[PDB]
């Protein structure tokens, strides 16, 4: 049974609600982004209307085989009528194709559902500027002040400089980047660009990247591993055993691996600056954990909410424990008293 925080009151609509069977009264199912916890349940046998971005719709059709007749892509930044209700899709600054959804309810209430997002000041100049929001359904993944991490630009600067130094000292080093979902593509694209290489990967991952409308993608990626000195591997293989095994396969072309594991936040964020990050090393193999986040930091979240001034907040992440829920409610009240709404 579908939980309350996935239902949109006064509509036939649900958000990210595909794992509950046929939801009573749902005439349109929205999907914010193509991450498995959110699409859980969709397949080629789904026969209800799915509303989403163009990119998410390319992934539903090619990767999950959802039939074309049930896929309803909407442009961003554009007022659309769905089943008699005005909606807008906004870029979520999460992974490719990810959106927030603005719903203008027939009774005059305005609801924002962030999906998963990384709040940014540029959102203060979208179509959100123009009007009031009564209810905010909020991605609270890192809603606690201990969650700090650098900008995505600083993280990429660190990875480019690290890779370029290593391969210039040793032209026979291979760079490897972990992946387990869409998102974080700038990590491996930026490194391959500085090295003058395409990125090599499996046919399955190439297929997924080909759905993402990335400009000039055919110039950037390949399935021919042997021609490439940046390889993508599943995240589970990013360990000394998996990498040893991979280096064997390359036919004595390389004699060193430098590997990157983009994580979310880790507690080594609480002590170390990005600049000071060091790898784990075993022999000719080195592994860097880099804190590339596609979710809001605590400070980015608080800035966004204090700007929007919603009348009510409904968290969508960390809702399963009483202690989590109580912690989040405390911060929402601090933010409201500090800013005066």
Residues that bind Ni ion (CB under 5 A): 35, 116
d(C-alpha 278, C-alpha 296), whole Å: 25
Q: Scanning the structure block, which residue is given the tokens 């059709």?
A: 61
Closest to Ni ion by CB, 114 vs 286, is 114
Q: How far is the CB of 301 from Ni ion (least distance, A)?
A: 15
Task: Report the side by side order of strands in the sheet with 80-82.
Answer: 80-82, 85-91, 99-104, 110-113, 135-138, 312-315
Closest to Ni ion by CB, 184 vs 198, is 184
Closest to Ni ion by CB, 183 vs 242, is 183
298: left (phi over 0), alpha (psi -120 to 50) or beta: alpha
Closest to Ni ion by CB, 116 vs 300, is 116
Closest to Ni ion by CB, 99 vs 192, is 99
Q: How far is the CB of 98 from Ni ion (least distance, A)?
A: 7
d(C-alpha 324, C-alpha 107), whole Å: 32
Q: How far is the CB of 162 from Ni ion (least distance, A)?
A: 26
Spatial CA neighbour of 135 closest among 107, 120, 113: 113
Q: How far is the CB of 34 from Ni ion (least distance, A)?
A: 9
Closest to Ni ion by CB, 32 vs 58, is 32
Q: How many CB atoms lie within 10 A of CB 64?
A: 13
At residue 110, φ and ψ (nearest 5 deg) are -120, 130
Closest to Ni ion by CB, 29 vs 39, is 39
d(C-alpha 89, C-alpha 135), whole Å: 16
| Length of the chain measured in residues | 341
Angle value at C-alpha 266, between 263 and 270, nearest 5 degrees = 140
d(C-alpha 338, C-alpha 326), whole Å: 19
Q: How far is the CB of 23 from Ni ion (least distance, A)?
A: 21
Q: How far is the CB of 183 from Ni ion (least distance, A)?
A: 7
The DSSP symbol for 49 reads -
Distance (Å) of CA 327 to CA 299, 307, 334, 335: 16, 21, 11, 13
Q: How far is the CB of 241 from Ni ion (least distance, A)?
A: 29
Closest to Ni ion by CB, 6 vs 231, is 6
Q: How far is the CB of 141 from Ni ion (least distance, A)?
A: 9
């Amino acid at each position: 049974t579908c939980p309350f925080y996935k239902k949109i009151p006064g509509t036939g609509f649900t958000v990210d609600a595909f794992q509950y069977g046929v939801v009573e009264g749902c005439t349109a199912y929205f999907l914010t982004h193509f991450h498995s916890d959110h699409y859980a349940g969709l397949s080629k046998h789904f026969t209800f209307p799915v509303y989403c971005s163009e990119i998410t719709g390319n992934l539903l059709k090619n990767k999950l085989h959802v039939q074309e007749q049930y896929i309803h892509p909407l442009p961003l930044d554009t007022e659309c009528i769905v089943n008699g209700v005005k909606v807008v899709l906004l870029d979520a600054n999460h992974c490719p194709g990810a959106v927030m959804i603005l719903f203008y309810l027939p009774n005059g209430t305005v609801i924002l559902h962030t999906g998963d997002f990384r709040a940014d000041p540029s959102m203060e100049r979208s179509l959100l500027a123009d009007q009031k929001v009564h209810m905010l359904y909020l991605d609270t993944t890192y809603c606690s002040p201990e969650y700090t991490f650098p900008s995505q630009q600083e993280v990429i600067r660190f990875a480019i400089n690290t890779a370029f130094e290593a391969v210039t000292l040793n032209p026979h080093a291979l760079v490897v980047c972990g992946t387990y979902s869409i998102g974080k593509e700038k990590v491996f694209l930026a490194i391959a660009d500085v090295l003058g290489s395409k990125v090599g990967m499996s046919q399955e991952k190439y297929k997924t990247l080909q759905c993402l409308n990335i400009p000039e993608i055919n110039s950037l990626i390949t399935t021919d591993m042997c021609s490439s000195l940046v390889h993508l591997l599943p995240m589970m293989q990013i360990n000394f055993k998996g990498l040893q095994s991979h280096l064997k396969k390359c036919g004595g072309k390389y004699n060193q691996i430098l590997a990157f594991r983009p994580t979310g936040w880790t507690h080594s964020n609480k002590f170390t600056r990005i600049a000071d990050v060091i790898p784990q090393t075993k022999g000719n193999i080195s592994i860097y954990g880099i804190p590339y986040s596609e979710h809001s930091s605590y400070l980015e979240m608080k800035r966004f909410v204090q700007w929007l001034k919603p009348q009510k907040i409904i968290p969508t992440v960390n809702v399963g424990t009483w202690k989590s829920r109580s912690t989040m409610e405390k911060y929402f009240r601090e933010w409201k008293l500090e800013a005066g709404y």
